[PDB]
C-alpha cells in the first residue's frame, strides 16, 4: 500500500527490481 494503488501494488514489489 502506498498511495491509492494498494491491491496494483502487487505488481511494483519484487518485480521492480
Same mark, same amino acid.
Given at each position: 500500500? @502506498? &498511495? *491509492? %494503488? *494498494? #491491491?496494483? &501494488?502487487? @505488481?511494483?514489489?519484487? #518485480? %521492480? %527490481?
Amino acid at each position: 500500500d @502506498r &498511495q *491509492i %494503488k *494498494i #491491491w496494483f &501494488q502487487n @505488481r511494483r514489489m519484487k #518485480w %521492480k %527490481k
